[PDB]
Assembly symmetry: D2
Homo-oligomer: 156 residues x 4
């Protein structure tokens, strides 16, 4: 059981919130960076980011976050699309996450990505894409998911 | 900082979730009672309920839960109305919460309750009622808020 | 990561404290029952008990609790012995835990139990018994370990 | 209710552990710095320190930590003295904490500090000093209290 600030909700040690106002990818990442983690002394230690996803389970959860938060927006197609922190560079195999975590989970819908270079990933909650990711263009305006800074104690 | 299951969200040691499917008051209380707290041994110890509210702060929070969860349904009136666990019996001063907690916080809108006997309270998130409660009829069908069983350690 | 009241310490969802004043088995279980879990409404829901142990890991932890809490009391023999909630009845195979959990872990030292009927188990932290359990007589007076009531949410 | 690693114990969002092996102030600060907080990505973000104390309530708690952890060492005098992260420079009014937090709580015993320049504070749990601090010399060898890195989410 995970501890998250009010209005956020937690799965495996990370804390998520779905934001409802449509922003393009950049400003969506930026919105997320307004959240942070500071030391009690006062120093800024880290920043929030667009959610990164690392497993079938993480992915199933964020799908449910979206599908139950937005049940009226669930179409038979791709829609709704919600941004996650996925960036796709020149080759389709230049996938990074904005938080700098590593792409160790593949949740693309069959055929995706395919609008590269410099596309961005989104949960596509429609009954077609069934939650799995689609890549879209950076200036598309959508709902987004943030994660608060991911952090653990080192006791070595 | 409160610990809540995934998809739920926490304020001051209680855990809340907003449900989107419209139910009448009874079945909304019931839906919440499907969630519980059991001992590790196996015995059911307690049940979830429609949220009860005990302070300006609790009430402000649930108001933001609804306002941010549902920004498209926010009218200039009273709507949207989301059920909480408030029951109003024969006199208007017979107010009880469904969890059995005590009515030590008055969050009614000016004029409310007024549809007694046997009306039920709802956060009315419209800009007019600004979150505060309205009493409506038990068979009206609305979105609801649950709280998971409320418990604390006794160390005496 | 587990959430426990101040002065207690947590491993896998349960909360432990080591108590320093020697009591016999009965009064040790009793001391633990002074701690409880109540609903916010006010009703007593459950009681603390002498710790029960369910795996190599739980057992390794409680061993470390004892060994690091009491490093001056660690002898080359059996001592120090700290009560856990283990009861041994008529046959040596009538092992129950006081919290009513089930005996699914065997942490007896080689040869133990062996002072039945109606002996009780204790972590024996000395370098000989290396933490594993010894059974001793009910009226022996020792330090003890409590656990706060064990509970989880049922979401089925 | 605070979330702490096993063997630690929490009060108001910070996590404390009492260590039993006597070290001088420097090495005691250092021992605490072996604990840290890193990002999931892998970067070291912050370090543990000797506990700092910021209120009557914090101080009451740490006093109970020491008094209940070491009931056999509690003399009618000052002893036992346990280090906290307090440093006293040239004037007696140059008090800093090792974590960098600010000295907004005065918990010195009547008359203390008095062994400056460059003395260090310790909870003096003896019945005389009743928990409050004493300044002692940096090369004295005592038990110490660590706190894990103190952090909170910034949501602004
Ligand atoms: Ca595409
Ligand atoms: Ca009304
Ligand atoms: Ca024996
Ligand atoms: Ca002094």
């Amino acid at each position: 059981l995970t501890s998250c600030p009010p209005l956020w909700t937690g799965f495996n040690g990370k804390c998520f919130r779905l934001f409802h106002n449509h922003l393009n990818f950049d400003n969506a990442e930026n919105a997320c960076r307004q959240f942070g983690l500071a030391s009690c002394s006062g120093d800024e230690l880290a920043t929030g980011h667009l959610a990164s996803i690392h497993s079938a389970e993480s992915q199933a959860f964020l799908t449910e976050l979206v599908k139950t938060s937005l049940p009226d927006l669930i179409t038979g197609g791709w829609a709704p699309q919600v941004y996650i922190g996925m960036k796709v560079g020149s080759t389709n195999s230049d996938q990074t996450w904005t938080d700098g975590s590593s792409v160790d989970y593949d949740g693309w819908v069959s055929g995706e990505p395919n609008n590269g270079p410099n596309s961005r990933g989104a949960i596509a909650a429609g009954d077609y894409s069934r939650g799995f990711w689609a890549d879209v263009y950076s200036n598309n305006n959508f709902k987004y998911i943030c994660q608060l800074p991911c952090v653990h104690y080192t006791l070595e």
